[PDB]
Symmetry: C2
Subunit: 106 residues, 2 copies
């Protein structure tokens, strides 16, 4: 059904989701083909004030958002295929324009 | 990170989620280890009247809901591990007591 670029090779998927941010963020753990574990996350359109504890690596699969680190003077745009590291102990805003599907590894 | 009983063997995860039901439902397509093709769905607490043109197999992964077939005299609880064929062409309800993770195929 799905074209190769529309899917991510995997080994396993987690049964249980976790919902946060007033119902607007959900994720499940997954094991990718390389054996590594990520949180496969969906973030609905909206404006989110967040912070990290440990550093986060985010690989965006689909959607569009603006990332703004508290102390930065411009945003970073996130589109399909983008990646970026949220440093440890970072306050930031995500403004999601199109539902954001991403792998978060921490 | 995940014990065996927390996960389901896979081959691929769809990149792009589909959101519906006023933000209450999200699906991505997945391919399981046996090559079969399902909608991996999260349905947030609520009560929803659903239907399909074709029979679909539901396999509940996590959470709790009551299923009520169109016109039926009582409901049926579907817990983690429960699978059934949902007939086509009938307006069933799912009352989601705890966020429901499920596969839906066929
Ligand atoms: Mg603390
Ligand atoms: Mg079983």
């Amino acid at each position: 059904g799905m074209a190769p670029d529309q899917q991510v090779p995997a080994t396993a998927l987690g049964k249980s989701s976790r919902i946060s941010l007033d119902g607007r963020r959900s994720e499940r753990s997954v094991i990718l083909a390389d054996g590594s574990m990520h949180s496969l996350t969906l973030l609905h359109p909206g404006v989110y004030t967040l912070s990290s504890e440990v550093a986060e690596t985010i690989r965006v699969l689909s959607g569009m958002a603006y990332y703004h680190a508290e102390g930065a003077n411009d945003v970073q745009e996130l589109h399909a295929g983008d990646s970026m590291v949220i440093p440890a102990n970072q306050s930031y805003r995500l403004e999601v324009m199109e539902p954001l599907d991403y792998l978060l590894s921490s």
